[PDB]
């Protein structure tokens, strides 16, 4: 059987086999095109680079992202990425391998139908399935009751689950993500004299965000300490040299998550979104929902985010009850681990979408047997 | 097929066949006319001498250079030189021999068109091509990534290439060359009592420059040592005798390359031109551009120029990265060797400009299929 | 009170009094140093020339620009220019005259602080202020709602304003300006045989750009008409004679604004920058933003730029709504006129930065009471 | 103070005091030695005659010229001439009189050092200076901008000056002078039957050149008129009688200046030398250089040389601009007048070379404080 698991995500692709511990292939989802003259002959150079090759040669070509937020906008590039992660990296023939895919909540209906058409016609898989990322995030921890806040690169969403029953009317989705956090860091870095406008310099800003930024417990006196002392500065070396210095911008970019007014959005922070989600459920299940808060996703690995979230949540909730946040040591690959666990149970082998059913019903069979 | 390679240059003509190791014919590009009365009869003496004959008989006739800087000014003399290097030296019929020519960057458009008209009509070649000298200089070393500084007799130019892609917006051209260096040596030799005003005495000054001058690592204390001791003097014997002595002018003429203010030009030296060229490219390719600096051309064979260039470049660039200069043992004929290599690949046999295309389109077909 | 208005800009300085119609002093911002021998005695010649004197004597000295892009790089030269425009041209004592200055968006923080330190200590002004150029450009037209595209010599920027409220998250800045347009014209003029390398010949190329270039409505068939007929050529007389001819380069240099790939930049044209800026605002204000597009700046006075901008904007926007561009007859001095209007209202007399406040708080008081 | 001015020249010595109108002593620079047996006793006749005495007694002794072209070849004779012009003619003691000397451009370095050694040791002057002749020629006319063509007896040179700044890289020197013009007249006079071989008959030929020769506006039809009519002949009376007749040789000797091929030199005429000098300067200063052409020197007082020079210059320069030549009524003593003016300014009293400086530094102090 040897089912396959693929996590498209947005900006990172994780693929592997079912029943393992960690994904076997991780690489960015980027497609590049040459930009310049192109003198000389005999080079035999390709017309498009996908994966780590574009990262290696990013100085002469332009980076483009097919996936954005949640909806896929470039289907030719997506077919290029799937061909690369099927023939070049995993080295497998998808003709005899069922696959499992993930999808964010509250997405256009045509996205699922087109994904099913492409997989069932271009690649000719025998079976396939689509599951929600945040539901799979609860399988990894081996739990049954809690509220999951899954923040990635495209969109952060919330969904409460109580003893194996979901509440579809208490699901909140917010666009704010790490891509807008990188853009904000790029914008506020210009006030010190550094200019980053090229699409190849967005990886430099992203790496700075991934290595230096952190979340402060309190903002007023942390800004006061950074305003007075110079003990909060670190140095970064650019690829060509010309080292730079970072001051109070170090802890200002991640703060946008709790105060989304820095970009111009009117929505509340993630602490108020998860409090409204808790208060949207039933009265007698809130006690169990408060003590089983789970964190997952790449954008949640800022230092001190668990303590800041705890401080604001207990600042809003009544003082009688107890509040805890579960930050597992692994928080990147929780979705993939849950998908691997789900794709191995003996009871799941009956919900595959066979090709006979697809042939008889058409692309509309997805809304029937999925969610 | 037996393609032909010709390198017009400025002051030296190298010609030969494709697939060999060294050019078969090297001779100056000079056309001379008799000056004096011409008594006696029965001599049967020609009215114009081209090539080494004018050098042998330079005492009675006047030397003239058709090519200058980059643009050709005497087309009748250029047709005389091409006829000499086609019938008298190579001993070949150009009717069944495609030819390859070289051209400096940033030249008038009419130069290419007139060269194509002359070759396709007066000589009736079946095919022809025009290539940039500094691009061909990278074929000889068997490399793909570096910055090439090609300094000859007419003009020195710079162009960066990264993995087979050129950057046309980072190309710098500077007039300063060896002809102005010979003129400066002629001017500063008068302060010791030697007068060289005749056009036939410019070869004497040129030979002195080619045999005695050298580049000093440091100028202040080298001028101090030459000012105090007399251990830096060499003797030269003129054709008629009257040996001469050279003192601190020995290392002063080549220094004009690094300080172009000695003649009156406002531009910076070649070390700052190549540093500005490096800084005009992208940020992440500068690391590979710094360690692949290539030297080519006749005027670059001064002793100690590689160490002086290294000292100034590392004096300007950040201390983190590494800087090296590649001075191959052969540096005259790098362009010809690259042209011979290029004119032998099987993949190049499709970019020839056929006569059918020239007949159908006209002289404007060059800007389409060249560069 | 008699407040003073100064517009540093980049390459042109406009100064005058508040409440007038036009600036009283316009002169280039250039500082020159002598280059040559300097024989003879009794001349009593200065060691540096600033203003129109350097333009008059540009044949023997070297021009240097302190201001570049946006940031000031030579503070000693800037203090020389301010001393010249305070004592030599305006003939005023700055001890009893508040001044108003302009600044481009997204600039280093230290630029404002150093400007405040210099003005408050070296010149001892009683009060001062700093305002954004594009905000002042809306005061001149007597409007409250529109989008302003201010393109000058250093940087072009965009900012939308709706009924007296700014949107800081929809501000775009692009380096591309007239200095890079002059450099491109200089580069493409070499293909006809003209060489302009001296810093004093950049004024010749600039004057050619200011007198001959124009924007074409369509590029393909305009290049076809210039390719076939010779009805698009004009003659220019150099200072020493030797008249020249300009062909299809006449309408090619200004086109770089709409296709910034001619130099190598990856950014989009100004029509797509202003379309992205419109789409970055709220949904119900776009209707009023489309019909109130305002043009300002020196580099916007190319013929046909309003019609070309209209054609591309209506080519991108939906066909239901109406699109208009307001090209006022005066477009140079719109910023100065707006500054004069702002510095005369009775309600503005409370936002001056007094010296008592500067003494008590220090140079950091600027970020509090400015923007 | 009463500074002294001396103009060595070549063939004529002018000396006098500073602040006067004309030189007080003019005499040829010639040293003669007796040739014949010398019978009789009691005559008390000297062994060498210097100055006008040798001219008076030239029939029995041999004339010799120490100075030639530019370099001094007979230092014992030069010390004899300076002793004669210091004790016999001026009747002054050089012990308390600073002196000023002149020197042609592009001369051997040892000439200045030996002149300084001789003056500072043999004559013990308190101070001295050396200046360029053509720079001093601009002081006499009270101007600041023009190009000076100074043609004398040894060498003619050119140098452009713009507003008190010299251009050392646009200085041209040509050997052709009046001594070669006298020799050519002597050579072409033999075709009519007159022989002049004695060194004492060179003064006869020189006086004929100074009294009869003139420059023709056009050469072809002037040679035609002299070939047909006999209205161009004048008579000269030799000291012993035997009057002679001069025909078309009258206007042929001065023509060698414009056609230097009559002797065998390859260089161009003075009109092309001054045109190349104008074109070697900057583009925007040529307009002011064309209209401020200045003539100086003895050899420039041929009739019609200003009109011939104007005709050729306007024949080469573009027709848009204006060309004028300033032939002041005095053109012999322009250099001396400029030296007298320079040696009287209060600002020049600080650039004297004192003996204390010479004692401390040595003969090499000249290259520091001169030019
Ligand atoms: N150690 C880290 N610290 C901060 N941010 C990180 C870290 N590692 C990854 N990220 C961010 O997480 C994002 C990747 O999220 P990912 O888990 O791949 O979501 P998806 O699978 O939906 O793409 C990247 O954009 C990166 O900016
Ligand atoms: N050994 C040498 N040392 C110094 N200069 C040299 C040497 N050999 C040649 N040159 C100079 O190089 C020039 C020839 O350059 P060349 O490679 O022929 O360029 P091009 O092919 O463009 O004419 C000559 O003018 C000569 O002055
Ligand atoms: N009539 C014109 N046509 C084209 N360009 C012009 C014209 N007048 C001025 N410019 C350009 O505008 C620039 C001056 O812009 P300016 O309004 O002074 O901006 P700033 O005040 O920021 O310096 C000059 O560099 C010049 O090239
Ligand atoms: N009236 C004249 N016509 C033609 N030539 C003259 C005349 N007067 C003088 N000369 C020439 O000018 C020369 C003198 O030049 P001079 O001004 O003394 O130069 P220098 O000072 O360098 O010796 C003499 O050789 C003489 O032949
Ligand atoms: Mg994810
Ligand atoms: Mg060469
Ligand atoms: Mg402006
Ligand atoms: Mg003289």
Curated annotation (Swiss-Prot), chains A, B, C, D:
UniProt crosslink position (Isoglutamyl lysine isopeptide (Lys-Glu) (interchain with E-272)): 46
Post-translational modification: Oxidation of Met-40 and Met-43 by MICALs (MICAL1, MICAL2 or MICAL3) to form methionine sulfoxide promotes actin filament depolymerization. MICAL1 and MICAL2 produce the (R)-S-oxide form. The (R)-S-oxide form is reverted by MSRB1 and MSRB2, which promotes actin repolymerization.
GO biological process entries: actin filament organization; actin filament-based movement; actin-myosin filament sliding; actomyosin structure organization; cardiac muscle contraction; cardiac muscle tissue morphogenesis; cardiac myofibril assembly; heart contraction
Modified residues (Methionine (R)-sulfoxide): 40, 43
PTM sites of type N6-methyllysine: 80
UniProt GO cellular component terms: actin cytoskeleton; actin filament; blood microparticle; cell body; cytoplasm; cytosol; extracellular exosome; extracellular space
PROSITE patterns, per the entry: ACTINS_1, ACTINS_2, ACTINS_ACT_LIKE
EC number, UniProt record: 3.6.4.-
InterPro entries on file: Actin (IPR004000), Actin/actin-like_CS (IPR020902), Actin_CS (IPR004001), ATPase_NBD (IPR043129)
Record field: catalytic activity: ATP + H2O = ADP + phosphate + H(+)
Positions of crosslink type Isoglutamyl lysine isopeptide (Glu-Lys) (interchain with K-52): 266
Keyword set includes Cytoplasm: yes
An example molecular function term from Gene Ontology annotations: myosin binding
Tele-methylhistidine PTM positions: 69
SUPFAM superfamilies tied to this protein: Actin-like ATPase domain
Functional summary from the UniProt entry: Actins are highly conserved proteins that are involved in various types of cell motility and are ubiquitously expressed in all eukaryotic cells.
Clinical note on disease: Cardiomyopathy, dilated, 1R: A disorder characterized by ventricular dilation and impaired systolic function, resulting in congestive heart failure and arrhythmia. Patients are at risk of premature death.
Family in the record: Belongs to the actin family.
PANTHER family: ACTIN (PTHR11937)
Note: In vertebrates 3 main groups of actin isoforms, alpha, beta and gamma have been identified. The alpha actins are found in muscle tissues and are a major constituent of the contractile apparatus. The beta and gamma actins coexist in most cell types as components of the cytoskeleton and as mediators of internal cell motility.
Protein name: Actin, alpha cardiac muscle 1
Name of the encoding gene: ACTC1
């Amino acid at each position: 059987t040897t089912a396959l698991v693929c996590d498209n995500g947005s900006g990172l692709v994780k693929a592997g086999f079912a029943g393992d511990d960690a994904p076997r292939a991780v690489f960015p989802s980027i497609v590049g095109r040459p930009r310049h003259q192109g003198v000389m002959v005999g080079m035999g150079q390709k017309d498009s680079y996908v994966g780590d090759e574009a990262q290696s040669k990013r100085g002469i070509l332009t980076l483009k992202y097919p996936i954005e937020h949640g909806i896929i906008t470039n289907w030719d590039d997506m077919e290029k990425i799937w061909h690369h992660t099927f023939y070049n990296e995993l080295r497998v023939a998808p003709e005899e391998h069922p696959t499992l895919l993930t999808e964010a909540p509250l997405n256009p209906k045509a996205n699922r139908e087109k994904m099913t058409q492409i997989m069932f016609e271009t690649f000719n898989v025998p079976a396939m399935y689509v599951a929600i990322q945040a539901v799979l995030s609860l399988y990894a921890s081996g739990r049954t009751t809690g509220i999951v806040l899954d923040s990635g690169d495209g969109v952060t969403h919330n969904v409460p689950i109580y003893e194996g029953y979901a509440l579809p009317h208490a699901i909140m989705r917010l666009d704010l993500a790490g891509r807008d956090l990188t853009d904000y860091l790029m914008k506020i870095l210009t006030e010190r004299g550094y200019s980053f406008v090229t699409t190849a310099e967005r990886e430099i800003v992203r790496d700075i965000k991934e290595k230096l930024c952190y979340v402060a417990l309190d903002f007023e006196n942390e800004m006061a300490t950074a305003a007075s002392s110079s003990s909060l500065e670190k140095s970064y070396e650019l690829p060509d040299g010309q080292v730079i210095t970072i001051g109070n911008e170090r802890f200002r970019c991640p703060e946008t998550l709790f105060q989304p007014s820095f970009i111009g959005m009117e929505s509340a922070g993630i602490h108020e979104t998860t409090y409204n989600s808790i208060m949207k459920c039933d009265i007698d299940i809130r006690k169990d929902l408060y003590a089983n808060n789970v964190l997952s996703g790449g954008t949640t690995m800022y230092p001190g985010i668990a303590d800041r979230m705890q401080k604001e949540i207990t600042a809003l909730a009544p003082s009688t009850m107890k509040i805890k946040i579960i930050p597992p040591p692994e928080r990147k690959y929780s979705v993939w681990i849950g998908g691997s666990i789900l794709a191995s149970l003996s009871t799941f082998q009956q919900m595959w979408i066979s090709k006979q059913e697809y042939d008889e019903a058409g692309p509309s069979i997805v809304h029937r047997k999925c969610f």
